[PDB]
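assembly run, all chains below
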Amino acid sequence: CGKSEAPPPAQTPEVGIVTLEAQTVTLNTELPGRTNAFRIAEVRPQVNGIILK
Amino acid sequence: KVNPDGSQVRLKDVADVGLGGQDYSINAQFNGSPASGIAIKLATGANALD
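ok done. output:
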């Protein structure tokens, strides 16, 4: 008639303690853009006439 | 808005985003302490004791 079920306690192990200290780090930032030629010349004529060749 | 040369405007330059309340009309407190809760009514035809 009842009078049972003794509760045991727990220990809860396996905690991952990791410490941290100050440091010196450099900061960067990504910026989007395009690539362009170093020098590009569009060939344009300076006379009048028919392209023969 | 993004231009073809890469310049752009994101949704942190015109606004500030955060998790807030859906409605700010009604607010409760309990003995001065900040509190919220749900008020429960009863469907008609059902017993209020069970």
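Chain B is about 0% helix and 10% strand.

The longest strand of chain B covers residues 28-30.

not gonna interpret more than that til we talk
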